[PDB]
Amino acid sequence: MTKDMLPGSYPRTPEERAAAAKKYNMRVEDYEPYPDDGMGYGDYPMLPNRSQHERDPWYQWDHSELRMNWGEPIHWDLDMYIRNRVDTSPTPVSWDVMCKHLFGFVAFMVFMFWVGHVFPSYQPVGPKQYPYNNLYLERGGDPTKEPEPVVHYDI
Amino acid sequence: MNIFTTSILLIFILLLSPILISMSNLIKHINFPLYTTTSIKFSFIISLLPLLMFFHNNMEYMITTWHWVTMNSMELKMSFKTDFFSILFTSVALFVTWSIMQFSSWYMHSD
Amino acid sequence: MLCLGALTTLFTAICALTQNDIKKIIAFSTSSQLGLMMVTLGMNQPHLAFLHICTHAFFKAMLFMCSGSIIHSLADEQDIRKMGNITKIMPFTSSCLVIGSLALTGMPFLTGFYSKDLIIEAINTCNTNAWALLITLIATSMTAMYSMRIIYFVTMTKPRFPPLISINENDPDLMNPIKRLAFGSIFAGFVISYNIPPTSIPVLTMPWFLKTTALIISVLGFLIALELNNLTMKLSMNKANPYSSFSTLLGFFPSIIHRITPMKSLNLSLKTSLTL
Amino acid sequence: APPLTLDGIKDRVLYVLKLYDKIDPEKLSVNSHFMKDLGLDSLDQVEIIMAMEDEFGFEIPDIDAEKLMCPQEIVDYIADKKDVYE
Amino acid sequence: SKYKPAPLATLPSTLDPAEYDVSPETRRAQVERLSIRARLKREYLLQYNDPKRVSHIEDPALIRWTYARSANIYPNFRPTPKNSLLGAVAGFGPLIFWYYVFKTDRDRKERLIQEGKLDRKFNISY
Amino acid sequence: SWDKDVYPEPPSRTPAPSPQTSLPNPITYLTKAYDLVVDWPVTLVREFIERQHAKNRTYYYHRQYRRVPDITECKEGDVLCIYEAEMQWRRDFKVDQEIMNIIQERLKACQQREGENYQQNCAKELEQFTKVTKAYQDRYLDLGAYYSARKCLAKQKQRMLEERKAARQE
Amino acid sequence: VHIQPRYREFPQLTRSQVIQGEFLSSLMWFWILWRFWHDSDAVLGHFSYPDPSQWTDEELGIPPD
Amino acid sequence: SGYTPDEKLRLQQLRELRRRWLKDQELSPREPVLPPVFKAYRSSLFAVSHVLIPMWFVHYYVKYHMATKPYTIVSSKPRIFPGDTILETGEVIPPMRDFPDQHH
Amino acid sequence: GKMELPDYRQWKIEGTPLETVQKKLAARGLRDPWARNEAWRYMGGFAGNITFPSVILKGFKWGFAAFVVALGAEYFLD
Amino acid sequence: AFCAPPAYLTHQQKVLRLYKRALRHLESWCIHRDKYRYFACLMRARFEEHKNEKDMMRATQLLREAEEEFWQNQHPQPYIFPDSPGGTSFERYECYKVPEWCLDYWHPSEKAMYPDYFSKREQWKKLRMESWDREVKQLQEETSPDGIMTEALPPARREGDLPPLWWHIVTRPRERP
Amino acid sequence: KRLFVVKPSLYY
Amino acid sequence: GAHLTRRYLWDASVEPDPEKIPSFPPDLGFPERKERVMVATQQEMMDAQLTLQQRDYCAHYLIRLLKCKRDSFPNFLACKHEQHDWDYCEHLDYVKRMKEFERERRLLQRKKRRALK
Numbered sequence A: 001m002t003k004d005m006l007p008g009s010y011p012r013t014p015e016e017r018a019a020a021a022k023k024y025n026m027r028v029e030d031y032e033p034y035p036d037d038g039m040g041y042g043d044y045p046m047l048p049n050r051s052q053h054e055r056d057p058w059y060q061w062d063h064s065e066l067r068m069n070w071g072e073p074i075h076w077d078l079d080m081y082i083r084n085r086v087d088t089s090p091t092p093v094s095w096d097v098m099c100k101h102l103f104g105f106v107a108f109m110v111f112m113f114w115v116g117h118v119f120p121s122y123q124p125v126g127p128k129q130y131p132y133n134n135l136y137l138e139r140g141g142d143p144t145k146e147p148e149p150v151v152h153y154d155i
Numbered sequence B: 001m002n003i004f005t006t007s008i009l010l011i012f013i014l015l016l017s018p019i020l021i022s023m024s025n026l027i028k029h030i031n032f033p034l035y036t037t038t039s040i041k042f043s044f045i046i047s048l049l050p051l052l053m054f055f056h057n058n059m060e061y062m063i064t065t066w067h068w069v070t071m072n073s074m075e076l077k078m079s080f081k082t083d084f085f086s087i088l089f090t091s092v093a094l095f096v097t098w099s100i101m102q103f104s105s106w107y108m109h110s111d
Numbered sequence C: 001m002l003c004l005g006a007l008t009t010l011f012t013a014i015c016a017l018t019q020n021d022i023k024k025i026i027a028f029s030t031s032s033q034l035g036l037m038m039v040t041l042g043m044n045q046p047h048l049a050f051l052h053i054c055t056h057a058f059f060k061a062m063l064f065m066c067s068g069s070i071i072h073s074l075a076d077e078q079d080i081r082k083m084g085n086i087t088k089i090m091p092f093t094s095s096c097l098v099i100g101s102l103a104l105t106g107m108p109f110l111t112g113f114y115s116k117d118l119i120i121e122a123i124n125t126c127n128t129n130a131w132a133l134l135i136t137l138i139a140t141s142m143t144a145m146y147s148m149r150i151i152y153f154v155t156m157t158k159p160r161f162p163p164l165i166s167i168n169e170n171d172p173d174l175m176n177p178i179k180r181l182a183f184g185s186i187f188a189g190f191v192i193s194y195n196i197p198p199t200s201i202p203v204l205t206m207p208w209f210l211k212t213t214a215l216i217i218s219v220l221g222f223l224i225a226l227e228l229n230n231l232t233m234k235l236s237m238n239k240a241n242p243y244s245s246f247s248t249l250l251g252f253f254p255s256i257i258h259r260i261t262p263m264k265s266l267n268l269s270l271k272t273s274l275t276l
Numbered sequence D: 001a002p003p004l005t006l007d008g009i010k011d012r013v014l015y016v017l018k019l020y021d022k023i024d025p026e027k028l029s030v031n032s033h034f035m036k037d038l039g040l041d042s043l044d045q046v047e048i049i050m051a052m053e054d055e056f057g058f059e060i061p062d063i064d065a066e067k068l069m070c071p072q073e074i075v076d077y078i079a080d081k082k083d084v085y086e
Numbered sequence E: 001s002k003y004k005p006a007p008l009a010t011l012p013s014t015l016d017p018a019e020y021d022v023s024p025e026t027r028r029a030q031v032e033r034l035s036i037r038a039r040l041k042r043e044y045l046l047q048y049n050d051p052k053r054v055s056h057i058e059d060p061a062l063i064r065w066t067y068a069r070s071a072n073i074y075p076n077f078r079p080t081p082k083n084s085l086l087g088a089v090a091g092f093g094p095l096i097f098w099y100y101v102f103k104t105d106r107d108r109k110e111r112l113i114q115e116g117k118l119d120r121k122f123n124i125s126y
Numbered sequence F: 001s002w003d004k005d006v007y008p009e010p011p012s013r014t015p016a017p018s019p020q021t022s023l024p025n026p027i028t029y030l031t032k033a034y035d036l037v038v039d040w041p042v043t044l045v046r047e048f049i050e051r052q053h054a055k056n057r058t059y060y061y062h063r064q065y066r067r068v069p070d071i072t073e074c075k076e077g078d079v080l081c082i083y084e085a086e087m088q089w090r091r092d093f094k095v096d097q098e099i100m101n102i103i104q105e106r107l108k109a110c111q112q113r114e115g116e117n118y119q120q121n122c123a124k125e126l127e128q129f130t131k132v133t134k135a136y137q138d139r140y141l142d143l144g145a146y147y148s149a150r151k152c153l154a155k156q157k158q159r160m161l162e163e164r165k166a167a168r169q170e
Numbered sequence G: 001v002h003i004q005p006r007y008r009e010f011p012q013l014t015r016s017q018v019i020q021g022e023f024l025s026s027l028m029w030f031w032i033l034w035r036f037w038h039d040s041d042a043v044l045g046h047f048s049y050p051d052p053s054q055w056t057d058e059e060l061g062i063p064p065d
Numbered sequence H: 001s002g003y004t005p006d007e008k009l010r011l012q013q014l015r016e017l018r019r020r021w022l023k024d025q026e027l028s029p030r031e032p033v034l035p036p037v038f039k040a041y042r043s044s045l046f047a048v049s050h051v052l053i054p055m056w057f058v059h060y061y062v063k064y065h066m067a068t069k070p071y072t073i074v075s076s077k078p079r080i081f082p083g084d085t086i087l088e089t090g091e092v093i094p095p096m097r098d099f100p101d102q103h104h
Numbered sequence I: 001g002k003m004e005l006p007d008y009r010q011w012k013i014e015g016t017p018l019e020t021v022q023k024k025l026a027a028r029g030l031r032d033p034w035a036r037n038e039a040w041r042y043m044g045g046f047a048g049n050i051t052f053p054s055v056i057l058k059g060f061k062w063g064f065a066a067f068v069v070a071l072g073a074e075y076f077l078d
Numbered sequence J: 001a002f003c004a005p006p007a008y009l010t011h012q013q014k015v016l017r018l019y020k021r022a023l024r025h026l027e028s029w030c031i032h033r034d035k036y037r038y039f040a041c042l043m044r045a046r047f048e049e050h051k052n053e054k055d056m057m058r059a060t061q062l063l064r065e066a067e068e069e070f071w072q073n074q075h076p077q078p079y080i081f082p083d084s085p086g087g088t089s090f091e092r093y094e095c096y097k098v099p100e101w102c103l104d105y106w107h108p109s110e111k112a113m114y115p116d117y118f119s120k121r122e123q124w125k126k127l128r129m130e131s132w133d134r135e136v137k138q139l140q141e142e143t144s145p146d147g148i149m150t151e152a153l154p155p156a157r158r159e160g161d162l163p164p165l166w167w168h169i170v171t172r173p174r175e176r177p
Numbered sequence K: 001k002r003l004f005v006v007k008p009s010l011y012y
Numbered sequence L: 001g002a003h004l005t006r007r008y009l010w011d012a013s014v015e016p017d018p019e020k021i022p023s024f025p026p027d028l029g030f031p032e033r034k035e036r037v038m039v040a041t042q043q044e045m046m047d048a049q050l051t052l053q054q055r056d057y058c059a060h061y062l063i064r065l066l067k068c069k070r071d072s073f074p075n076f077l078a079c080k081h082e083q084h085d086w087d088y089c090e091h092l093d094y095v096k097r098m099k100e101f102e103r104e105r106r107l108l109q110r111k112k113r114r115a116l117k
């Protein structure tokens, strides 16, 4: 495989744009290099950011899993857009409407949990009571040292 | 403590014979789905004897089978805490898996 | 654990109320009962949380087997919208499918009553988070609402499956394993509850409404479900609302978290680390 | 379920069409065109394919639905999709 | 009502204003794209169905992609103020952040061992 | 067998069975049948082996390691005497790892058997652990990966000085 | 058994599944009834929950202001 | 609106080859050409070579390798009640104190 | 074992909830041309209305019948 | 799946496709068949209504309006056939679809167990080779002098000729291996 | 009818 | 219940903050209170293996209940009277603890009154 069949540097002239498009099997009016900020793209095509979930599922794609065709130009971020990963397909609910609803619910539940911490539910019952000095010895208190008499009455 | 220990340890050996068989030539001659289902069934039934002994005595165990390695002052041993939870869960789990194993022979009959 | 668990039981029950795949409804049932075991541990009730695991294994396993029987007999169809009238064409499975639902929804003296009932008795009579208590009781009624969803659409309406009928359930490798669970779904909790050692002191003393609280909400959940699911027979069109969209789309947590989070991380993996 | 055979498909395709009202059974053969010999419009043939998908339990993609214009074509599209060869 | 798009929730094809364009200039774009598509599809098939093939079908589009993303990045990289700041921050940004987390933590730890205010009660492995 | 002084073990106190129900204990039956069908045949196989091990009785001994001059008795640089002081310390340091494990076995063995009374009836074993741990930490903690006798000595001298300076004020 | 497939008509049900299904439903219903007879208290209650106002200051030992 | 005549003619030809392909997949009567009790002797050799024989090895290991090492098998101390007779020393646990007695 | 489809003039929507659809649609000039393709669902062996009580109260008959027998046995055995 | 898509959908195709989508979603909301039949006839009323409006500049404006109405009344979870894209059985058996060429590596001792399948297979490999040359030739003869091309393919115009590029369609693995 | 099952060469 | 309504909403001083009960001296309002009596001794609870939570004042009944469940084995249903006894004694203890909320509430309501005077 030769140098002119491989990606190159950013196309400065329209004569090197139509050369680049023909390399990548695109229409000249469709070829669009990445912006020349010198981040290393060269002249590789900038293709629309659609994940492969959006490709026609019923078509018999040549690369069946990737939903591509042989020869077609591959998006720069293909491995981020394969069907196992990021999905950009349209949702029934707008992106921001989901975002406003999800965190409103999570935020509301967080608030209501604190409310329930300052107004706890309990029963009108005084504390449990245990014998032998609150079971001082059985909790591992020191046998030699004498606990403080804690006592409970019949009522 | 030998019969309790032996039955506890014996459950693992029963479930490991389907794994061993699967790695020999025998698996191509027998009805391996039925062999596993029978194997797990006997495992469940043995799992009741440790279960009953706990219902009688409520007495838990700590069985160290193997010494694996010492990292200076910190030994790592294969050891089982056959207490209340693992005694009862072991039986419930082996009972459900006896159903699912036999269910699979019907559900996956084409696979 | 008390607040993390309580949130799980409500959130997944809300999700389960409007799903259509049979397994996702059952899978969402598990998430909610798992959250309730978590709520139990926040009461310092470890032995109840475990007794629920042991009880919940029986009927929940059966529900998947009874549901998995339908799926096989309908050419691997799982949408309950294409199931109907199963209490007649598949008697055995439907019978076990209704034992499983009632064991799950805490009906007295089934496997799931000797666990769920005590937990609902405990959640009321302990010092706790008021909101965790409140939503955990609501989620206990929704357990009847979404179980009724399966009983209704799967067993009770009219047929909606394709017209070539080849439903067979006479295989012993199907009936026998389901029966074992069916006995477990009925008697197992009783035997377990009476043989284990006494663990903790149950608060057995409470007003009459905290002692039947579980039953009433479960009954109420069924009653509310009947009315709601019987408006679908009316010749009036159903419309979207934000509350059902939230239920149907899992609160949008997957649709956001599984899109934004992997994008930013995988975008950093390439633009920053590898390239820059 | 039982295997699909070419005659069993053919019998179920016509059976579904004979319960359609806008079709008149007495003049309904396998070669009947849906737009010429029966006088059905586009918006009906869409509902006809929808009725086939329900009958057989699988979808026909739209790129293929819009060309199934006679009972034989439907029968042959189902037969080729489900590896039915006699 | 109305649907507001985003990068992770694109616009449905049926809601795209530019998808109901029918002016002749677009229709000719859409017909050359198919012709380019069909020309390649024809060439792939003339290899896939070939009986004398004995190896796989090499993919120039995939060779270009992998080469564009490795052997061709550096030649097409030009330093700029935005790159240099980005690399400087990306490079030493996290490294300085962690230095103070660990250094601050271990200074609080070394401080508390000189004054004995630590509970290393049962700790005998490190 | 094992030495019951290295591994102390309270005697078992099993209550004598008090069966007041008419029914038969199914534990006590499978225990008889287990003894006849499992225990009895196995004990014959073992008695057969130990009669072979009696015919070929062989002996092995615990190796004695006399004491060599300490590190403190080594002139700086004399690698001949440092080497032996270093080998001895490494032997000593290793025996101390195993002493710690033994003290840990007891504490673990007590925690299990006391069960619900470990907070009270496991005090003595928790006290030896708490004491033998402080000694271990005073000998070997913070030495590092390249621990040796000379670092052990340097750590001790730095501690004997920090305590002498306690009374030099008090 | 090897049932026969049926088109658009309700299929025949083997006796085994009709009775195997029927037994289990009745086994459930019997067990609920049997339990709810002997052990009704566990659902309804067994102990009375005392009212906290009928109690008199004598037992609670309040000292009259 | 549907198949064009050339379209429909291609399907006839492929469909002809296709069905002649799937027919070829059918196995002849003689293929594949391999190269060569309800609770008894079938159910004895299982419960006697997967339960009994494995129990001899597991018992041998427990009895002479695990129970002969210190602390390998450690059990909870059994419950002892006020009234029990201890099978070892013969001691008798004194009876409890006295209950005022109650009835619900 | 060959298929034998039912006679296709069997499927008639009279006396089924599909009638009420033709009543409702025919009150505004429309008509359902696929009603007879839905009909087999609402007639024959699939007729009726399964009510929730009938599903829950299944085997209650014989469960209650066994209960009194079992309950009676304890009385006599006492 | 079998038919390659056109360059662009016509207005007629974009309205039929919507019609089918809108019915399938209706059936998702209604569930009950009687209720689904009632509203499906109302739906057809809304498509028969403007059936003849042949303005061709308001027909479009009647479609974009109707798609924007569909996108708001979507079912958030429509019914899908188990084998369709997005279906639960979709691609379930793709792990059992071994290509026919994998038999060309079979050991002879493996091929010795199916002597008659492996004999009806060398015929097919012969038929494939003899036909290939004439297939390639026919595809050039129909290469239209103008580059305008479509993914479709020509049939066999002669006798004793298989349609060009027929092996990957005829031999494809069974849908349910 | 029994159909042939295409498999990879498992002999190796 | 009422108490939660009362403690929130209406007054908030005449309601026992449940985590500080008792609050007033034990002997106030009582001529002499008899210290509560423990039937079971430490050796007996410690030898029947009672979890610390179980060593409440009703332990003597639970010691009998366990004694039954071991001796009636395998008959796991043959200890219902023993369970009822332990369940009853716990109920009484619970009622005892219900009398502390009332007493403290009533007393704490007294202090509000006399304090106004």
Ligand SMILES: CCCCCCCCCCCCO[C@@H]1O[C@H](CO)[C@@H](O[C@H]2O[C@H](CO)[C@@H](O)[C@H](O)[C@H]2O)[C@H](O)[C@H]1O
Pocket (backbone or CB within 6 Å): G018, G019, G022, G023, G026, G027, G030, I059, I061, I062, I063, I066
């Ligand atoms: C101690 C444990 C014992 C528990 C009780 C065991 C009871 C055993 C029940 C056996 C059931 C016999 O099943 C028999 O079959 C018929 C089928 O027509 C069942 O069903 C029949 O009657 C029921 C009653 O409502 C109708 O709903 C149904 O449409 C009809 O088919 C009946 O229930 C019974 O007549």
Ligand SMILES: *C(=O)CCCCCCCCCCCCC
Pocket (backbone or CB within 6 Å): A121, A122, C124, C137, C209, C213, C216, L001, L002, L004
């Ligand atoms: C006061 O007792 C606080 C306890 C917590 C309130 C829980 C409410 C439970 C609802 C049950 C329905 C009762 C039917 C009359």
